[PDB]
């Protein structure tokens, strides 16, 4: 888009349109994101999938906006967390992941 | 039978909840009235991460959690640790849905209006029950024990009460509270006991002294030449075996903890105590009732189950009474459950069924609809 | 991969350290934890001139260095001496430039807080390692066993502890340090052997009573009645053929050895045993905990290894125990690696990713950072 109001001669100013989704991306990749809980728990010898579970809200719940809580009814069989990915909110289902 | 069966009875209480459904002729489900919430992150072997817990598992698990007790003095205090023991009670313990079950709730004394209507609008709006209704405690211990005219001396675990109730009407201006209950006489006795020259230190050490309390605890009448007995040293002693081999005794101070509910004085309180108030009850109604609440004193609760108490209480206030009176303590086996026991018969009734508050009456009165 | 590979754990020990790739199963080095400094001035056929030795070299040379341990009791006492280790085994040892790999290490049980604070001020200012994270040796050596809760006894070279663990957290209050481990074990054993009658003369002779120790000691259940078992002379003893031919045998006080972790008054040590220290680690804890700890009393250690601990503990246990207790003595075949096990599972793991203290952390924050 730049280069054309850079071609042009428009004056146009903007943020890398990108920058929206980075929130959601380093929730799911970055170190004390849901991977990284994922990955360890599975080092603990005695973990459970509600294990996993607690470890993941303590850490996200609430000081996370991408992160919440799910809606559990509607189409959706059951409850663990919900992401908010730029087509939506998913609810997603924490069990056998371990 | 769509009912018959179906309707469920709970009893919530201070330190107990009993349940179980109207038909039966004792609670199915007895458990303590706590909800603990883990003061660290963790699991137990094969369990998920567990954000509460209920009753016993809450008692057993008590060194990583902190346990809250939703009901002080019989009156719901957290309304959202309530709902908890609720539902634990409904799906777990009596594995029941609640949303085909008519529920019988108990309630105390001079509960607060807000709090009848609060459960209401709990039980109707996030339990879905098809109906319920909320009997006082006084008034279904007395009519489990057929009548409908007499005094309730009631106590628990963190209340005691005296409702006076006539033709089923419990007399609101007449009704005395005492907070001393089962509770506060289990920690006297850890006092009592220790001051023998003993120690509970471990959980396993704590908990009992409470089962010695139920076992070997007595309500001596002339509780006055009976410690003069305990000092010519009978064969009045009585030694209980620990978790262990530990054999502790317990002559004497077995009935000085009882004597607590006839002299407060014994533990810092200086309210009067269960039989002066029993009396100071009924020289608070008319006047034309009075012979009737004489001859009426029903006994229920867990505290009121130490043997002696009704002989001590026959004498104490025959003594305060007018002589032209006719005194009658009565004292049934079942105490410990009257005040459920009451319920089952009342909502296994034939005609209880024109009472029951229905989600038709609630959907289109509003809270107040149960509220009277 | 980037640090998936990438991820070292050193575990520094009082006798060994063990060294390695986080992902492997055991450690890809072991080697004794010595720095030898040349007591004269030479040189070997083909070398320079060696200011210092370190591991294998130190210990085969050890007739014209002195020997110093820089590791006292689990705790790094000498801090010129260890950056000395560190470096040989990152570049000789394992052979990695250490500047590109995130390194887990471990501490001992109450490590003084400036210490954690200096070992990372050199692994972050003189190693320059892009992250690296310290953990507590016996929470490694539980999770390694799967588990969270439970209680170590871990027993090395220098130190033996108790390090009872909940939900994850060590349990600060409730550790317990017994000052006698493998190295006590060997000098014992050479007494009972030379006052079997015998001569560990040259350092040939020496260094193999430790062979012995590890090869053919053992640790009987019911120790009484196996003294007893010895002078009837059974075919329990058992002969060790030495360097050369030199056939030494060895009956009896083939056991008589680790009976000396059960009772150190064997040694002169007026310290109370492992098995009345685990339990009274226990009776430390919280009372809620303690059936937890006891079904999980989870063993690991050099000198954990000789057979039959885990029987004699089992049933020391159980004997001071409450019998309403269950009694549960974990431990594993690997026990000898537990603590570098857990930790390379810890730093392969998906989740630790998080935890790694970096160096923007640390020229950040100073070295309170990874303090805790």
Redesign the interface.
Known sequence: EQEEYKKEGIEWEFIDFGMDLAACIELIE????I?????????????????????LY?EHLGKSNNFQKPKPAKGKAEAHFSLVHYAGTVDYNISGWL | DEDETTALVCDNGSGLVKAGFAGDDAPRAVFPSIVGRPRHQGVMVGMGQKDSYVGDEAQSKRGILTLKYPIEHGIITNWDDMEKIWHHTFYNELRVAPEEHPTLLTEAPLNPKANREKMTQIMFETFNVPAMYVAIQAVLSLYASGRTTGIVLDSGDGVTHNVPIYEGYALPHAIMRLDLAGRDLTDYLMKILTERGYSFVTTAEREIVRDIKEKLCYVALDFENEMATAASSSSLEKSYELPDGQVITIGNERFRCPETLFQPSFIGMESAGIHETTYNSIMKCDIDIRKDLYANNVMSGGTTMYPGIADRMQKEITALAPSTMKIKIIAPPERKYSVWIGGSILASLSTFQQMWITKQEYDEAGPSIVHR
Do not use: Q, V
């Open positions: 970055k170190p004390m994101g991977f990284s809980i994922l990955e360890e728990e599975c080092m603990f010898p005695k973990a459970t999938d509600t294990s996993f579970k607690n470890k303590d």
